Amino acid sequence: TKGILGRKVGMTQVFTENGELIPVTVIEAAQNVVLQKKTVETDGYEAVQIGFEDKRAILSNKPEQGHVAKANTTPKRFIREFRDVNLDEYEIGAEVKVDVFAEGDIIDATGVSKGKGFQGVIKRHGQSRGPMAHGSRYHRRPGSMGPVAPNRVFKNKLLPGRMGGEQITIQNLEIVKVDVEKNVLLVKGNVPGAKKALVQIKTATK
Amino acid sequence: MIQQESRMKVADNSGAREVLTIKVLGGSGRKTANIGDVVVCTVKQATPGGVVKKGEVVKAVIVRTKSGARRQDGSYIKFDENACVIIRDDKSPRGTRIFGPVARELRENNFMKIVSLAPEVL
Amino acid sequence: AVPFRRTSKAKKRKRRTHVKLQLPGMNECSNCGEYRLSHHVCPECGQYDGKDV
Amino acid sequence: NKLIDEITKSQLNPDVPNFRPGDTVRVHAKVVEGTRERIQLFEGVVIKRRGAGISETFTVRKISNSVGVERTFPVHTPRIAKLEVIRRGKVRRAKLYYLRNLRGKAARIKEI
Amino acid sequence: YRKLGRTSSQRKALLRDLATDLIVFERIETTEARAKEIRKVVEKLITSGKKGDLHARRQAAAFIRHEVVEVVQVKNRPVYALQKLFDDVAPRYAERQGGYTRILKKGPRRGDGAPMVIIELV
RNA sequence: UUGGCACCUCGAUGUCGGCUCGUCGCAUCCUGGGGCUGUAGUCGGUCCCAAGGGUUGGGCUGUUCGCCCAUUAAAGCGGCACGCGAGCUGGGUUCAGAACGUCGUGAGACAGUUCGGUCCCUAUCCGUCGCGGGCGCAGGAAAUUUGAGAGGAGCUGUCCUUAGUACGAGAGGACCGGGAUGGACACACCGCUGGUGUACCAGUUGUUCCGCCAGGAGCAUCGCUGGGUAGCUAUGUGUGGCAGGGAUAAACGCUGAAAGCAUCUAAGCGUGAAGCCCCCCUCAAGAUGAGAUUUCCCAUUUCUUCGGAAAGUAAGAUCCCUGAAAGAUGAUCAGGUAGAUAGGUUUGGAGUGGAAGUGUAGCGAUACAUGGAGCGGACAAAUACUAAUCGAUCGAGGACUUAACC
Ligand SMILES: CCC[C@@H]1C[C@@H](C(=O)N[C@@H]([C@H]2O[C@H](SC)[C@H](O)[C@@H](O)[C@H]2O)[C@@H](C)O)N(C)C1
Ligand SMILES: [Mg+2]
Ligand SMILES: [Mg+2]
Ligand SMILES: [Mg+2]
Ligand SMILES: [Mg+2]
Ligand SMILES: [Mg+2]
Ligand SMILES: [Mg+2]
Ligand SMILES: [Mg+2]
Ligand SMILES: [Mg+2]
Ligand SMILES: [Mg+2]
Ligand SMILES: [Mg+2]
């Protein structure tokens, strides 16, 4: 199981050798370093901690500087753990390049979905509108809060509230191209998040 | 992108001039039919002396739509109108002639007799 | 629609725990010697504490 | 995006001629019929050209057997053997959607 | 871009009014939201002024108000805001790339607590 | 269900059907497993286990119901104030008008019909969905996390092959296994196809204005019309429910006595469901049981008999300011000259479609050239020109006991 951290650059399309045209997400994954290895003896579980993008000194504090000094590297914007990896691979301070993947590798992409702010039940939960005419005064409303008997509302009556900005995993995206000199992965289809969003690419759990 | 109540020109030689879509086939709640899909339909306008008569409930394959079709190569095809061809339970047309162009998608769905009779297959 | 019970003094006072003003963000100027909002012009001197006008 | 431009640059077909909406073009389109690959000519007026770089598409309209047919292509698709501009049309706009509601004579584009 | 509690046409009128005021008076007091919109519009008028040619003068003329700034006296002819923008204001920013305005924060207005600012050329 | 009773409510517990939103039971409609069959096969019948998910769109009628059309794997039956009117509707019913049949001498009335007919309310509390502030968590901090526990998901068709094999006199026609491809549903995203796009580009009418012409501006739904960027989007695209594992239900067995036999059961072994627990996705240490790892700061001053107190600080954080990928506000995240955070500027790009001025041709409307021109919100990159100045505020000094090393 291999893993890397990249930024979503954007979407485009590529023609396959076949001739088919496929949509791709461009993930730029430069400056991934191995910062720490967690073992069962020390931490209670196997994981490798990867630091992604380089960050100006004045944006880092002394606690951060002390943690990346152990891996002889500069402060890092994003630090994430990968579990289910082989710790025998990964030396502390080693770069992690996008060539840990190959064209045809099936990956899971994890990121935070775009923020839509306060949203109603129609957009947030795909509920149906009431009629728009025939005397209706019920358009974009949540529906009955429930029956009478329990003198209260059950605990998953879906209602308006803040919509996106959740963690999302898309499973089984094909890697379409790996460009090491550009530190670029091309992934078939889309991954969560706005442009410039952290994307965690790891080998498909399935 | 044809649904219940969508009317369609009949692109063939059988009596039917205009059909009304009664049902998109192939799924419990299937909303929409595309090029190459078979619909159940009623004949709303007939040609006097034709084989297929007004009020007859028939099956028809959609052979061109305004909502066209995407192809794997990333190209699309769209027609100026929605037309269908009345068929038997074997995918053969009730008519002897097909009028107007017909989408290549028919050849893939195995409507070979229709593809052969069509003046152009785009 | 309407209050079922009047609100007690305690409950009213708890609700107002957060109904308050914050102190303004201010500090003494060097040239003036008197208080001013940060990132504002100081009227005592009559200009921006740093940039003369 | 400059990085997406660099990555896609290699897939830009340089054989693509200069054409505008209003031009009559002849698309030599590859067609995989049964097993053997075939060239089907599609000749019509360029109705629309939209997008940028590898994502740029154009649409060609023709009347086939008294039915308007529109064919939309990626500009840089390798499934177009050859695109030749047959005549240069005199038009006043980028999108000739008005042609969708005109039949013969009324739908004529003046040649330049 | 900011909607300043106004419809589209009201907002264009407001921007043209304030843009002209800043060109004519060179220093105005307004609300922070208005100033943050005015800097964009005034800096583009000064850019036109620096371009200097007839096409740019006519683009500015479509925006700037027909206001008299002063009456100068050779006969005494009036000077129009457009003339001030092309002859007085623009030429004094000939060696300055952009950043023709500055916003000084002032303090809240008594009647509505609106945060007021000075916006000035320089 | 039709009823019986009259116990709560007449200083009001809104009553049918529908819409929205569901949730529960299982007496199971489908899908899963199985026994018997008057089970050859394909289909079925009947019973047992099984509530995970699923369970259509129309015609008629206020309807519920029901019949019908066309589908579907299937079109389950019930409960929740015949669920849900401070959520909607208001067709029916149950008001004042009017009329018909009928009854009544009449006023009027109905085992009846008909046309028409005011649906109020700013949410206090609990509850539900989101989002902050406080304190806690025996020092103060910055990150990375474990997962007790919770939520989500859970559906299914057709075709090909196995095989025209098994089975059958034929007609017909499989299990099991392998593949492909759908429907419905969900999540993400805008490259594509489209939608929108009220500070983008163009055309155009009327009238007023800019002194006039030219060129522009105002108002007429953004005047109208044709396009359209970013953003937001579905009807668009990508992906998912894969494959498992453990223990079981009904059931099938093995060994096996009680009961020299027999017997799946008593001791003891196995098989065995879409179900249970995992696996998958998300939240999660206020998990007060307040967990773990890495890193940072250190043991200051004056008082307090005493315990402790207060007052400068460290690491760090905030106020304030520039903002957007974030957003009701807080919050979050990107920045604050240790500077590309925003605006401007310069160069691009999309988009529009050929500016103005000038010239040429034409009697002229206009055309052509200069010239893919000019314009160009929100997109890209560079650039410190403008503004993120200058300040201030908060924030440790680590209790006791015992054990183990020591
Ligand atoms: C078969 C019916 C049985 C009775 C119904 C109920 C009652 O009287 N409802 C009132 C209601 O009028 C309005 S709703 C228009 C009021 O808002 C509502 O609160 C309420 O009073 C009215 C409809 O008659 N009774 C308690 C029992
Ligand atoms: Mg947002
Ligand atoms: Mg609906
Ligand atoms: Mg309304
Ligand atoms: Mg209760
Ligand atoms: Mg207007
Ligand atoms: Mg009694
Ligand atoms: Mg009462
Ligand atoms: Mg049962
Ligand atoms: Mg009706
Ligand atoms: Mg009821």
Ligand SMILES: [Mg+2]
């Ligand atoms: Mg009701």
Ligand SMILES: [Mg+2]
């Ligand atoms: Mg109610």
Ligand SMILES: [Mg+2]
């Ligand atoms: Mg009588």
Ligand SMILES: [Mg+2]
């Ligand atoms: Mg009535």
Ligand SMILES: [Mg+2]
């Ligand atoms: Mg309300």
Ligand SMILES: [Mg+2]
């Ligand atoms: Mg309240």
Ligand SMILES: [Mg+2]
């Ligand atoms: Mg709990």
Ligand SMILES: [Mg+2]
């Ligand atoms: Mg799109």
Ligand SMILES: [Mg+2]
């Ligand atoms: Mg678009």
Ligand SMILES: [Mg+2]
């Ligand atoms: Mg006008």
Ligand SMILES: [Mg+2]
């Ligand atoms: Mg004029």
Ligand SMILES: [Mg+2]
């Ligand atoms: Mg007027």
Ligand SMILES: [Mg+2]
């Ligand atoms: Mg035995």
Ligand SMILES: [Mg+2]
């Ligand atoms: Mg087992």
Ligand SMILES: [Mg+2]
């Ligand atoms: Mg299943």
Ligand SMILES: [Mg+2]
């Ligand atoms: Mg930038």
